[PDB]
Chain A
Amino acid sequence: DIQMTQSPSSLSASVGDRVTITCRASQSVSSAVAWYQQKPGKAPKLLIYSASSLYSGVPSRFSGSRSGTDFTLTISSLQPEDFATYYCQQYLYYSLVTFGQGTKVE
């Protein structure tokens, strides 16, 4: 039962700004952390897998890093389409999946 905590419950930002979202894990989960982006009324879309690997079809602005237990999602060039809810995930095992709480960006 690894609990994922997301630091910013909300993050107001302007177009072209750089935002950072941070995740923390109860235990060590290696790099088994994925980042999602859910727009209202739509299913989430995977952005970064393995905590540092950009998914195919995703703009290179998105980035992820891991420093031990702390996982950070960073976008350096925010765009009008970046305004969505960004979730966290630890996927160390099939039955051990826990998501974050959400980082609605406005």
Chain B
Amino acid sequence: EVQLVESGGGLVQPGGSLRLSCAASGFNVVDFSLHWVRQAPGKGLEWVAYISSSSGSTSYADSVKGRFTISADTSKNTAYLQMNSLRAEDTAVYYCARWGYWPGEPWWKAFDYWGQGTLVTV
């Protein structure tokens, strides 16, 4: 069945680097846009980044641009999120979600399937 699994989280000193991952199963990353939604402990969900196994349009949040690098590897059917220069505000649980492309209903379904999430503490 469709399933997204996150891995690569942990605890590092502030200013360190982390390499988050989001494994996928039951679907391909080529026809779905994989996002990264972050929820701070005790706070709400905020969008962080997104990547496409298509042409390659990527984006980042204004409060996170310049220090995050999201990547996708369609060979391994997983998406990675490179982290560096981590600040104290980056401590949160990172969820990876999937979102269909514009033509048709898959786009209208928003983040239909999420991932269990991984915790990062700095």
Known: A55-B109, A97-B47. 10 other contacts (CB 8 A): A32-B108, A34-B110, A46-B109, A49-B110, A49-B112, A91-B99, A91-B110, A94-B57, A95-B59, A102-B44
Q: How far is the CA of A22 from the CA of B108 in the complex (A)?
A: 20
Query: Chain B, 85-122, contact with A by CB distance < 8 Å: what is the 0/1 string?
Result: 00000000001000100000000111110111100000
CB-contacts of A60-106 with B (<8 A): 87, 89, 91, 94-95, 97-102
Q: How far is the CA of A1 from the CA of B62 in the complex (A)?
A: 10
Query: Do B112 and A46 have beta carbons less than 8 Å apart?
Result: yes
Query: Do A99 and B47 have beta carbons less than 8 Å apart?
Result: yes
Q: How far is the CA of A52 from the CA of B33 in the complex (A)?
A: 23
Residues of B near A46 (CB, < 8 A) are: 109-112
State whether A44 and B108 are in contact (beta carbons under 8 Å apart), knowing that A87-B45, A98-B47, A100-B44 are contacts in the complex.
no
Interface positions of B (Cβ within 8 A of A): 33, 35, 37, 39, 44-47, 50, 52, 57, 59, 62, 95, 99, 108-112, 114-117
**Which of A44, A45, A50 has its CB near the most chain B CB atoms (within 10 A)?**
A44
List 6 A-B pairs, minimum CB-CB distance, nearest first: A34-B110, A95-B59, A97-B47, A43-B114, A99-B45, A50-B108
Query: How many of chain A's residues have a CB under 8 angstroms from any CB in B?
Result: 24
State whether A43 and B112 are in contact (beta carbons under 8 Å apart), knowing that A97-B35, A98-B47 are contacts in the complex.
no
Interface positions of A (Cβ within 8 A of B): 1, 32, 34, 36, 38, 43-46, 49-50, 53, 55, 87, 89, 91, 94-95, 97-102
Q: Specify the main secondary structure of chain A where it touches its partner.
A: mixed
State whether A55 and B115 are in contact (beta carbons under 8 Å apart), knowing that A44-B45, A94-B33, A94-B35 are contacts in the complex.
no
State whether A99 and B46 are in contact (beta carbons under 8 Å apart), knowing that A94-B35, A94-B57, A94-B99 are contacts in the complex.
yes
**Which of B37, B59, B111 has its CB near the most chain A CB atoms (within 10 A)?**
B111
Residues of B near A87 (CB, < 8 A) are: 44-45
Residues of B near A49 (CB, < 8 A) are: 108-110, 112
